């Protein structure tokens, strides 16, 4: 299903980053996708099921969550973080600021696992120096 | 009886109820002006360790203003 990806803050993702981005708390708060209940039923998924998000720019696995802040029809919400930033639009249009918000993505259910914080970062393949 | 009840695990610590309450406002000029109390005062509830914390439930008149001010239903008027 093609949806519009919106990203930003959450009181829980703020609590998590100031508690520790190495903690499980952070995966639970930021490695998620918020959806309207009708959209979850349209996709055939329940809270706790995982979703594969793919865009022109990347892909990520996040845990589906029912939005307590209702979304417009066709929109989903991933909190700011490295999972969301696998998939949002990097280009700045010569402003220095990327397009973190409102990005066309494709979402589909998946049985793959959510990558924890250090495992997610290895996707970028850091070479020492 | 109907009384004030806190749900701290849903709470943001935002302070709207603390400021909105007239009893708190009446006793603490800083709370009336939107600040957390720095003076020692006895008021109905405070934000403590990041969440709403009821300290003097006997002063609560069950008017309902705090409830109107909470967007996440973390403070309510219900039985017990």
């Amino acid at each position: 299903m093609r949806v519009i990806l919106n990203t930003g803050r959450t009181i829980w993702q703020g609590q998590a980053i100031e508690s520790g981005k190495d903690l499980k708390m952070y995966v639970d708060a930021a490695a998620i996708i918020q959806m309207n209940p009708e959209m979850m039923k349209q996709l055939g998924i329940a809270e706790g099921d995982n979703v594969k998000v793919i865009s022109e720019y990347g892909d990520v696995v996040v845990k589906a969550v029912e939005a307590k802040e209702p979304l417009p029809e066709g929109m989903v919400y991933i909190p700011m973080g490295p999972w969301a930033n696998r998939v949002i639009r990097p280009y700045t249009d010569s402003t220095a600021t990327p397009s973190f918000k409102n990005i066309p993505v494709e979402i589909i259910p998946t049985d793959e696992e959510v990558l924890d914080m250090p495992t997610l970062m290895k996707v970028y393949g850091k070479v020492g120096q | 009886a109907i009384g004030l009840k806190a749900y701290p695990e849903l709470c943001h610590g935002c302070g709207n109820c603390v400021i909105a309450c007239p009893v708190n406002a009446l006793r603490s000029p800083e709370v009336a002006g939107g600040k957390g109390p720095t003076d020692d005062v006895e008021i109905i509830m405070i934000v403590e360790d990041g969440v709403v914390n009821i300290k003097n439930p006997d002063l609560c008149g069950k008017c309902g203003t705090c409830v109107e001010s909470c967007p996440v239903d973390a403070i309510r008027l219900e039985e017990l």
Binding site: - | P22, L26, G61, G64, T65
Partner: protein
């Protein structure tokens, strides 16, 4: 028997009926009851918050069904019936004296009181004249001269002109088959005839030369109705009426006393007030300051709900006299006397 939020207490025949939707949570029934059978929930909570409890709870094991609470209730929310007619019609039972009436011959159907009524107890109807009957003229369109350019239909400010547009076909090689003026809608302003590029419209306006005879002076009719159970006698209609056709008398006399400095403007009493007595005046110009909590006791009935709702008791209600039918029971006299302050 409790169904939904309503409460009926039965003994066999006497029946006390409580109507939640009519209860303003003023508390007076609880105070006057000789057997302390009534406990009234917090006024603010019941008005401002969602609750599944009823506004009142009555203990039937102590209730002796004397009917003083039903008498005192200013909002018609408690009614006791005896075999099985309401005591509101029994002369032996004391009644509080109140009234609200509209003189239908004086009333001009402006609907101000319908709008002002804090309880929506008033219905005002009025039948206006039809538009054609306040206007006069002639208008005809010569359809063969008409080339169906649509300009008159567009310019007509009341959409009185209609054109039967179509897509042409070889069988019907025209862009329209008819044009009409709805004289029920035409107000004879003349715009169409002036914009018509081919002078196909004949229109003559007669209002000024023939208005005195051709147009009848409008008689506006209607009626009024005050719902006696929704009505609470605040007096807004009496005060709002431009022709003093409305008359209201109240049950209680008293005083309103407000402490502006104790008041912290939580707005509870404002929302609680069933008579629209209390308000937060908006400052008229920048830098100007207002009375924190403004009252107008002309609309006040001294039911006491605001005082009860205020968590800092910044608002207090006094009550000097309760106007009633003659009281002969001395139990009744002292309970009515106990509500005076």
């Amino acid at each position: 028997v409790i169904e939904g939020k309503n409460i009926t207490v039965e003994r066999t025949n006497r029946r006390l009926i409580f109507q939640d939707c009519l209860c303003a949570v003023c508390g007076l029934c609880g105070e006057i009851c000789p057997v302390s059978a009534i406990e009234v929930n917090p006024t603010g909570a019941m008005v401002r918050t969602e609750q599944e409890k009823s506004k009142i709870a009555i203990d039937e094991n102590k209730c002796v069904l004397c009917g003083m609470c039903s008498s005192i209730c200013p909002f018609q929310a408690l009614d006791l019936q005896i075999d099985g007619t309401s005591i509101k019609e029994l002369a032996e039972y004391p009644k509080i004296i109140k009234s609200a009436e509209i003189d239908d011959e004086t009333c001009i159907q402006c609907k101000a009181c319908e709008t002002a009524c804090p309880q929506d107890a008033i219905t005002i109807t009025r039948e206006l004249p039809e538009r054609k009957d306040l206007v006069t003229g002639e208008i005809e369109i010569d359809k063969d001269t008409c080339i169906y350019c649509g300009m008159c239909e567009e310019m007509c400010p009341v959409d009185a002109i209609e054109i039967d547009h179509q897509t042409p076909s070889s069988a019907s090689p025209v862009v329209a088959t008819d044009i009409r003026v709805d004289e029920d809608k035409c107000v004879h302003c003349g715009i169409c005839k002036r914009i018509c590029p081919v002078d196909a419209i004949m229109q003559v306006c007669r209002i000024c030369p023939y208005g005195e005879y051709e147009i009848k002076t409008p008689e506006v009719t209607g009626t009024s109705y005050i719902d006696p159970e929704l009505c609470v006698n605040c007096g807004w209609c009496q005060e709002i009426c431009p022709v003093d056709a409305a008359t209201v008398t109240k049950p209680f006399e008293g005083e309103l006393i407000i402490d502006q400095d104790t008041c912290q403007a939580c707005e509870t009493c404002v929302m609680v007030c069933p008579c629209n007595v209390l308000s937060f005046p908006k400052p008229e110009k920048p830098g100007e300051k207002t009375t924190k909590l403004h009252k107008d006791e002309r609309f006040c009935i001294y039911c006491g709900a605001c005082e009860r709702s205020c968590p800092v008791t910044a608002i207090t209600v006094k009550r000097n006299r309760i106007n009633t039918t003659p009281i002969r029971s001395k139990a009744w006299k002292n309970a009515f006397d106990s509500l005076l302050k």
